[PDB]
Amino acid sequence: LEFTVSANTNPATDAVRESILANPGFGKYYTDHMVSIDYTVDEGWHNAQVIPYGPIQLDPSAIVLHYGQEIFEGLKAYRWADGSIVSFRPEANAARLQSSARRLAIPELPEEVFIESLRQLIAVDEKWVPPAGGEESLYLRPFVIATEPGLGVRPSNEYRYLLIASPAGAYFKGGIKPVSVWLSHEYVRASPGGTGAAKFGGNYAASLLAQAQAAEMGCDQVVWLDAIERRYVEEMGGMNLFFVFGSGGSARLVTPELSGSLLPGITRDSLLQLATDAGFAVEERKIDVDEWQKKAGAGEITEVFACGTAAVITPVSHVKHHDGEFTIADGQPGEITMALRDTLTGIQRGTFADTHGWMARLN
Amino acid sequence: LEFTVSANTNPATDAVRESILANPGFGKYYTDHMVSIDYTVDEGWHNAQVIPYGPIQLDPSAIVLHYGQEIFEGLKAYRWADGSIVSFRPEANAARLQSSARRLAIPELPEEVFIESLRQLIAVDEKWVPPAGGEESLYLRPFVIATEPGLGVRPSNEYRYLLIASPAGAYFKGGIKPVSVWLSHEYVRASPGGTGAAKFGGNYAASLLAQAQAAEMGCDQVVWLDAIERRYVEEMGGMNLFFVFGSGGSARLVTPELSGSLLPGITRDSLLQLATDAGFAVEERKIDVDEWQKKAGAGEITEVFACGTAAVITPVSHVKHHDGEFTIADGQPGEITMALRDTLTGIQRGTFADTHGWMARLN
Numbered sequence: 148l149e150f151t152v153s154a155n156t157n158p159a160t161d162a163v164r165e166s167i168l169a170n171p172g173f174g175k176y177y178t179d180h181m182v183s184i185d186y187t188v189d190e191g192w193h194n195a196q197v198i199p200y201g202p203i204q205l206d207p208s209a210i211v212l213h214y215g216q217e218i219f220e221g222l223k224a225y226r227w228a229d230g231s232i233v234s235f236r237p238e239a240n241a242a243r244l245q246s247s248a249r250r251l252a253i254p255e256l257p258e259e260v261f262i263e264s265l266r267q268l269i270a271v272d273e274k275w276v277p278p279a280g281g282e283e284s285l286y287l288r289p290f291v292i293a294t295e296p297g298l299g300v301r302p303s304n305e306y307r308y309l310l311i312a313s314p315a316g317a318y319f320k321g322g323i324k325p326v327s328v329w330l331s332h333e334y335v336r337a338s339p340g341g342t343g344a345a346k347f348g349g350n351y352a353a354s355l356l357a358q359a360q361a362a363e364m365g366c367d368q369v370v371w372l373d374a375i376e377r378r379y380v381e382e383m384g385g386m387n388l389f390f391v392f393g394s395g396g397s398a399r400l401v402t403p404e405l406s407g408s409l410l411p412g413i414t415r416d417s418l419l420q421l422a423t424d425a426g427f428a429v430e431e432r433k434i435d436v437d438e439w440q441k442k443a444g445a446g447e448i449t450e451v452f453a454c455g456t457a458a459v460i461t462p463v464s465h466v467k468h469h470d471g472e473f474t475i476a477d478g479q480p481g482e483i484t485m486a487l488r489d490t491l492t493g494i495q496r497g498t499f500a501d502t503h504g505w506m507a508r509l510n
Numbered sequence: 511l512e513f514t515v516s517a518n519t520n521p522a523t524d525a526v527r528e529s530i531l532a533n534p535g536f537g538k539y540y541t542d543h544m545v546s547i548d549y550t551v552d553e554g555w556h557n558a559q560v561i562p563y564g565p566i567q568l569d570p571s572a573i574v575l576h577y578g579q580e581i582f583e584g585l586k587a588y589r590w591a592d593g594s595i596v597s598f599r600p601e602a603n604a605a606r607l608q609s610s611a612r613r614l615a616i617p618e619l620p621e622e623v624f625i626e627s628l629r630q631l632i633a634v635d636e637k638w639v640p641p642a643g644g645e646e647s648l649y650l651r652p653f654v655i656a657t658e659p660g661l662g663v664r665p666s667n668e669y670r671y672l673l674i675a676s677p678a679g680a681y682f683k684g685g686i687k688p689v690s691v692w693l694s695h696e697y698v699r700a701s702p703g704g705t706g707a708a709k710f711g712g713n714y715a716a717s718l719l720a721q722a723q724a725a726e727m728g729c730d731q732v733v734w735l736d737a738i739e740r741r742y743v744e745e746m747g748g749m750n751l752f753f754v755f756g757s758g759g760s761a762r763l764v765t766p767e768l769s770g771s772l773l774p775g776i777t778r779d780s781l782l783q784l785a786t787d788a789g790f791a792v793e794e795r796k797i798d799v800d801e802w803q804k805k806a807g808a809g810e811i812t813e814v815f816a817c818g819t820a821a822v823i824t825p826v827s828h829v830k831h832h833d834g835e836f837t838i839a840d841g842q843p844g845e846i847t848m849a850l851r852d853t854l855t856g857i858q859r860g861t862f863a864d865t866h867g868w869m870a871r872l873n
């Protein structure tokens with residue numbers, strides 16, 4: 148697949164760009180260009196090009212605007228001391244976009260095309276990648292939407308793959324601050340035979356009310372419990388959860404298993420490997436509120452944190468639910484939590500050795 | 511709200527429009543104009559206008575394209591013998607859109623504005639409404655999409671309400687024909703507290719694989735079973751289901767109750783009332799596959815049909831599932847099924863008395 152480039156003749160001035168990079172926030176600003184690739188049953192993926200960031204054209208009856216056939220991904224690009232630009236496990240996001248597409252009846256995008264789209268975008272907007280060393284980075288948002296017109300209900304025959312980039316400083320409004328959680332009693336994130344294992348837009352729209360409720364109960368984020376027994380802890384918003392038992396080199400990590408409805412986070416998969424590298428024992432199993440509250444109060448569960456691309460790792464210090472409320476440890480970020488976060492971020496920034504070859508050069 | 515009109519400078523020529531009305535199909539062609547209303551926090555619903563049907567623009571980071579915050583409705587406009595243009599229970603759709611909006615954290619659109627948008631579109635595209643005395647009509651598709659840019663996960667603060675129309679010819683060209691169904695053993699349509707009771711795009715994209723599987727099993731449509739026990743019959747694709755016990759004037763009708771995850775179909779609500787008017791006893795309860803197959807085999811259940819705006823009523827003659835297969839009666843459309851369909855379509859067409867005042871004038 149050959150990419151054609153249509154330079155932006157009116158990009159953001161150096162002043163504006165530098166200003167944005169100084170206080171980027173998250174998903175607020177976007178780079179000067181974006182990648183676009185069209186799909187049709189006859190020509191397959193074609194017309195791959197790098198064009199200026201700008202409004203998209205859609206037919207009023209476009210399937211995505213009626214039957215929500217759409218999927219997305221999220222990863223980052225970092226600038227290293229040697230001036231190189233790299234991404235964290237981009238191949239993993241390429242594979243998950245394919246798995247998400249399959250579940251939503253969307254044509255898969257070749258991984259080499261996915262990776263290439265990333266190189267093409269950085270090639271023109273490399274100056275949007277924050278300076279080396281720091282919590283800042285360039286968030287990459289690959290996504291596919293159904294663009295074929297027609298109000299009939301069925302898989303679209305036309306799709307459009309888009310790749311946009313957004314400078315990122317910090318996702319949450321706390322960063323080095325722990326969050327309180329409300330365990331949803333009324334809502335579920337997904338159920339067996341659903342789309343829980345896919346990065347599907349529909350999953351998020353349906354969770355808006357649950358999040359609003361968490362805040363109304365005086366908590367920062369909502370936490371999901373299995374839809375079958377309404378007992379086992381799954382995730383916190385759009386992030387996976389980890390439970391720390393004990394402390395020091397003898398501490399062990401427990402995280403909900405991939406029941407099939409849980410979203411296989413890449414940060415989650417990476418942290419499991421990092422924990423093992425540090426010598427910590429790991430375990431992927433089911434864990435319910437009862438055990439959580441009991442062991443947390445007993446002092447066995449010393450820390451709890453959520454993980455995801457945007458925030459990397461977010462400490463969980465307070466828990467509230469339909470039948471109780473309790474604090475984790477002293478309510479502050481745990482030792483292991485910060486230890487693993489520093490290790491992961493260090494690897495991503497090129498500070499620590501990348502023994503697993505997770506860092507890929509984009510340039 | 512005042513509606514400003516911008517006439518289509520390049521409308522469909524008489525030759526083209528006539529060719530379309532002669533063979534419209536469904537959701538394939540669209541009228542010359544569409545309605546558009548914008549929403550912002552500071553101005554709420556505003557800039558209501560009738561403009562030429564055409565491509566709409568959206569920022570690449572528009573929430574609807576990432577987190578699927580969108581909803582829609584489906585109703586029809588009919589031309590009567592007296593020359594007036596009417597619609598079937600439009601107020602009901604206006605109220606359901608508000609219900610869907612609430613579930614998806616979207617600002618509600620006043621019923622008055624909803625109805626008015628329908629009148630405004632007919633005022634300029636009346637020529638697109640099929641002739642009276644037939645089963646043809648004009649399908650109306652009201653829908654709202656989140657348009658605010660930003661990759662952050664939260665309720666949008668900007669939306670756009672759009673209204674498009676598509677001429678619909680006789681649904682059953684070569685006479686009415688029954689369909690075969692496959693009870694989905696692997697997939698579910700929704701879960702408790704989920705978004706099953708809302709006309710939300712996400713629900714459809716997530717069911718694409720299930721429908722494909724139904725066809726792969728040699729069936730026309732997929733039928734949904736409750737996510738909890740995986741035994742109670744819910745719906746057929748995007749249509750509600752009815753079961754007819756016995757026949758004649760003593761026949762009884764059973765239909766799945768509005769558990770909370772079931773979509774409150776307007777056709778469904780209407781048919782229950784019409785069955786009562788005809789003297790038929792009705793029941794809104796749970797019914798599982800076991801009872802269905804057993805009673806259908808014993809001849810107790812004489813007919814089964816699905817209902818929805820598009821097709822009104824569709825007979826179900828064959829059933830296949832993980833643990834069996836059977837036919838309903840002689841495999842042909844049942845007496846009650848056709849009786850109720852003729853009655854409902856007769857009211858919508860103006861042939862029969864509208865004792866409940868369901869028909870509303872649009873002109």
Ligand SMILES: *Cc1c(COP(=O)(O)O)cnc(C)c1O
Pocket residue numbers: 221345346382384385386387410411412413414415454455456457
């Ligand atoms: C994206 C996502 C995550 C995190 O995945 P990462 O690959 O670590 O970014 C976790 N849970 C859900 C539900 C998600 O959509």
Ligand SMILES: *Cc1c(COP(=O)(O)O)cnc(C)c1O
Pocket residue numbers: 584708709745747748749750773774775776777778817818819820
């Ligand atoms: C729209 C819809 C229906 C039918 O509703 P009508 O108001 O009768 O058109 C039934 N089930 C689902 C899942 C739907 O989305």
